[PDB]
Symmetry: D3
Subunit: 338 residues, 6 copies
């Protein structure tokens, strides 16, 4: 495969997390998110009716897809993966299936995914899509409701505060998850990476259905291991997981295909660690724990030396900007390369 | 204590002498930028960003369309002040960028007319203060106005600032005459704010870089005409004041605080000046900025706030402690917690 | 079927009529509707161009799905059936097929059906959907143009004033009716009741096509007899029809809307109004008393007939005070 | 005075009550107004924060000033008196003094008083203005706070729920009442009638200041006996120049549940009785939330006209 | 076919070009083109990001579909063919597939094609649709990038200023072109004429796919020769092509847009403009006289060729006065 | 006066006509304006209720004050005079007195006069304001109702179709005219020229009141003769009036009394100041169907002829509905500039 040989040498990509959570920036009504500001709805059990009010404050006058792609290109990043829909269920593209999206529901009235697709194509960057296929806090049958024995970066995995009755993920899978995956894999050109997440609920068959649908629409798209249940083309390591040299040299009993930490089998020999510059995925006002240029440089070098890609995230602010400290960290790391 | 119903029975002078502690609010379009613009930093003063980065008015004005602070709640801000034992609240009606935070008939560059928010922030804070029994004060940039070709500061650019120049020297590069801005915008807006928001206890002017003694006097007399009990700070300039504002964050050492010595540049903003009435105030910040600044997390501790307040008050100096609201109209969590923490150290 | 045994014992449901007609409230340009305010467009032959202007006045700041469902629940009602689209053709949900709907066309910019679905699910009420499958005054090929020998609550059954040429219901059936039924039966979760109406035009095959489509998307949904042509799971009696003992003890024009019809499953329902209109009507204060509501309910239920009692929400999205008081009063008469 | 001789023979006028209260139509949160729907904010102590939400629902697509005036004219009404601002304090004209008004605060974004002024002038009806000078539930210092020993069509005369501190009408008088009276008596052409309330709170001096201001701006405007200043042009009789104001049903504001409309014959007979004694009949219409004359009101008026020949 | 015999005797139709280009009227930011105003994005290489801003200025308060159709009818025109989407890629109908359209993207918030469809039906005019199936300057994979039959020479017509990389029309064909053709052939009633254009990229198979899809959805729709590759029911001559007697009496590059081509059914049409532009152009006052229009029509018709005469509406939705007067004047020259 | 010596040598200025009429562009319901497209409301007796609909179509995304001033400057024009309010009564600035204005009533929501003032100041062009003090078709008491024996570029001078009863200009003078003049002479910096028009109704006292008000607010502002009644600082000739050599030499059209409220010919000028305002085509407002653009040579020669007699040439641009200078207008202006050394 051309995509396979490409991904093996791609080395470095930019990830983007952006959504309504970015406006809150890790604070709400005088209380804090966890280190993951994008989990704030769960952490503080924000009712959908309240969280939806953020739509009216979403008018990011500084968002400029071409400028973001240009920054990625100047840093030597070869692909960009963006949140089409995170756990809160809010789509960052024009979804016919669900009007809870950036185009229909906000004054911004623009398809963010559309703009980033176009910018990537112009600049010659490959384009990837993140989608929360399991969790959806906007849906009564969103995933996570069987997993609450496992601690989260919020409270529960699912929206357990608005929705307290019988739940069946199958219904959300059929009505929202699969239709939206069809939208994003149809409407934005060639997709090189599909980034799924936290497969807490979906069955082997549901993972397979997604896998097959993605490949039908996007034959060369690489799917990451967090689609769950062994249905994937490359392995995502844990959040910010920089494996020890020894373990990265082995890339290594039973594997839990739905765990998100550590190595898993990879027939194609493809691996990626997604990481953050500070400690959040979403923008977080009070997290100034930005990794230094030296740290970023060394993480990238270590991953790449062992055949692992580094997908480094930017959490855009409420105005659509790369935080200055994020940009300076990225450019600083780039300056340390020959 | 002989006043009309609805007024404070304590005379403003005796009140201010014992007031000890007030809240200041800085809020405007600069709060959206939060100390950054196009990948570049403000100075420590995020509200100075327009000058620091010479942002053209045509660009800066675009911020109006992003100003929809759905979490602004005047009653909640007043409640925080009151529970912390603050006895007054002083709010930016218009800062150096020239953008009004009230419904100005004189100038549509304001929060009511120019933003989707379409609400009179000063009006809401006035009403909240009245309901809670807090005295209400108004900050107004009478000299600098970066939205006005004749805004002040154009004679002062030999002196370093928290931006670049004192004036807007990038959009406006020709002949300038502050007198025109004084007549057309400054005096009319002062008349608005001193007329339309009830009883005003404090008038907080700033950086008197340009206005003449006569212009200072004209302001002083107009404020007193509209608001006979309003106390005016020393940064109106030229000796026209009722109380002395110390420097920004100026906590004088015991010896200086005791002596308050002057035997004076009336247009300087540092150090003591004469006060016939014996009234003094230090305005300070919880972090290092007046406006909200995303990258300034240097929040003073509860203990520091408590100690600063106690030190100032022991020497008869009031502490006016600022909150820079964010773009959504919120008190930053660390600021709220610092204030509540300081309150917990009293009893 | 679980839905069958449920419906047999459900006894009592709330119906909702709400639309652009609710703003007019039974008056337009100084003239009155009939007793049916929701028929005003036909009664007064309001041109579509004029009627559509109502969209801009539709901003019901007091609409609260949770509060409506809570009132139903407090009254012992076990299900709620709501107008997704009445005869005027205006959809009260986000229809991709047709932008003449509450989400796309009004400042309210909210999916009313979506909000009611969510509220019903949270409170454990079963949810039903009303759809005018035959009449559509917004469509040149809307039904009713073969039926004008039969008296109406307006003028004609069809829009005969904007559309005066050749008509063919098959075109509207294909392009609007079936696609919208697919939307409402796909996008709002489990649907327990489908309430069709006034089958003045559609063929046996068209009734069957709807029936099959509803069952495909909603296997447990019970369909009422006004789908027409014998394609149904339960019998709807006439509007406000409280049957006399002889007929009710015993329980055929399949497209008539009055009287009994065969019911293989033994399921029956009378839909009624608290006043005399389905839609909100400013000048109709003829509210049935608590005792009348109580007695109608008891009478219907003793024959195994469900009582589906309608509320016509006002232009602000409110239950009229007199309607709320009637319902709560009736509930107070149960021991 | 030309206005004096005119008013003596005018016989019949239309009054209009219209405001945010008209949207509620005598109900709020499942509770009733009294017979006076326009008093609902007081009756049910609706907080200003909640009541103000009505602004967003105010888009009366059927409001047509020319059509209202044409109805008045066809019935032989010679003047129209309209609510510029009722007790709730919401102005139905573009007020520079206060943005709580129909132009600035609603999607309708139109000056209702302006449109009615123009319509009256085109049709040759004299134009009159009603203004609540004492009560103002939108103002902390609105009047009524000395009068709560007297029962009302609501609860208290003042807003006693949002505003619970010291009250001094002098402040509202200076900042809102006098400035708004100056607006309405300046910006809408010749005003023939000024309709104020019976003063619960104003001083003699304040009533006099209003009288003098009106006459200064509108030298031919008639002031009636309600104003309380002790100088007036005509006597406002119960709710040689005289006028009785009345309603067609029992509410001033539109009230969905009041269908107690007076018959054509009643209106005809009442008007004839008043006119035989040299009393003008000022008959109110309460427009609905869409800006319409209720059908039964229109039918009553035209019916009464048909009984004259 | 009924449409075949109808088209043979129809003789005279109205064409409408209307879009964002109509606002610019051949001028843009200190530049101008006297070529076809609807081509201004290409002729002045206006970036999509700039051109899109025109959406916010599009509020044609004078647009009145009934009035346009009534003008056509009074002139004896028997059909109306309107731009659903021209080369700039902006749809003049509510497209689910692409929000770059007059309903979703402009304050006008109205379906222009929908309104014209309804107006035509009421007046008894047949309705036709123009769609740019090949060029689409809003799409990176829009057609035009393969120089048609002449090597290089500047003879590409894609958007080559915004989109400079490798291109594959098949992607746009699948994702935008075919879905939109399905929309317009599904959602606007009976379509009598399909007017395609400049087939310089699509394959014979792609032409066939369009042809078959149009016929599936609209069995009576006649397709013009500019669909390309021989897939058509009638021959479109060149723009404004008034053939000489010799050529007209006699009547092959299937993808050329000039001259005669074989016509099994004997159906032919020349589309022409009243001035020299299809879209409205501020500076083009070169209006043909009544006499010229009359004589062109007679010349075309005497050879069995229909005359499809275009109106370019202005930015307010109006027929330019000189255009209306030319058309009515030509009508006055008929008995 | 500095302004007097300045105006005498200024020679050449730009005028701007822009308003709701620019959207119609001289056509309405299939009917034509006269040569003056800005008079279309009167020509076709458009009811105010209908004309007001134009506000919702006014969103001129290509308006750029700096670019308009830059064109003026490139052509050697030394001042710019813009319509704050023409006969239709629609204000092109934020008027507190009247919400029928470009800021309050249109999606554009921008103060056109404010933007032009700022652009003029940055570029060092003097700034002038046009205001229709007499006619106002939006006001029942607008002027013109005594003058309908005299033909116009529409029908009547006044709005005689919406307003058919008794009229008294005094009311409009007090409530709209004087307050708006106060606004525009207060809120837009130093004003060098005040351009009034068609003084069909106002009295000598009313002309004087305006004159005094303008001078109070703008001491150095030069007021043109169309204020009426002899109350002026310089003489405006007729529309597009290029006087014959003999008359231009004498600065006189006849030997006796002048009519101070006529708009044609010379009048006395104590300060020796004169100006002809003219058009590039035949309309003041933008006109879709008027392509009768004067040639570069004509513009050059008109300017030279006027200037040789100490008469200024104030040449108008009628912006289109998008806020643009028509290309043919720009090309005529730059063409004329090219013919100067
Ligand atoms: Mg009274």
């Amino acid at each position: 495969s051309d995509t396979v040989e490409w991904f093996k040498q791609a080395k470095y990509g930019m990830m983007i997390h952006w959504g309504l959570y970015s406006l809150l920036g890790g604070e709400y009504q005088g209380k804090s998110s966890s280190n993951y500001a994008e989990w704030v709805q769960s952490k503080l059990q924000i009712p959908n009716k309240e969280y939806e009010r953020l739509t009216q404050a979403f008018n990011p006058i500084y968002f400029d897809a071409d400028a973001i792609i240009d920054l990625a290109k100047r840093c030597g990043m070869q692909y960009l993966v963006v949140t089409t829909k995170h756990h809160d269920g809010f789509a960052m593209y024009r979804s016919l299936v669900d009007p809870y999206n950036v185009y229909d529901a906000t004054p911004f009235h623009r398809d963010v995914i559309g703009e980033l697709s176009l910018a990537c194509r112009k600049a010659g960057l490959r384009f990837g899509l993140y989608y929360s296929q399991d969790l959806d806090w906007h849906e009564p049958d969103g995933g996570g409701y069987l997993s609450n024995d496992i601690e989260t970066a919020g409270t529960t995995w699912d929206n357990s505060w608005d929705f307290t009755g019988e739940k069946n993920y199958d219904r959300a899978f059929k009505h929202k998850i699969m239709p939206q995956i069809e939208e994003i894999m149809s409407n934005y050109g060639e997709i090189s990476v599909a980034w799924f997440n936290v497969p807490m609920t979906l069955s082997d068959e549901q993972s397979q259905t997604i896998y097959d649908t993605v490949k039908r629409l996007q034959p060369d798209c690489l799917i990451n291991s967090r689609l769950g249940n062994g249905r994937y083309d490359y392995v995502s390591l844990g959040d910010n997981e920089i494996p020890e040299d020894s373990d990265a040299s082995d890339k290594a009993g039973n594997v839990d295909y739905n765990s998100i930490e550590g190595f898993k089998p990879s027939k194609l020999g493809l691996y990626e660690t997604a990481g953050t510059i500070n400690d959040s995925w979403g923008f977080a006002y009070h997290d100034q724990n930005w990794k230094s240029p030296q740290t970023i440089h060394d993480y990238k070098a270590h991953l790449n030396k062992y055949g692992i890609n580094y997908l480094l995230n930017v959490g855009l602010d409420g105005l659509g900007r790369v935080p200055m400290a994020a940009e300076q960290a990225l450019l600083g790391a780039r300056a340390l390369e020959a």
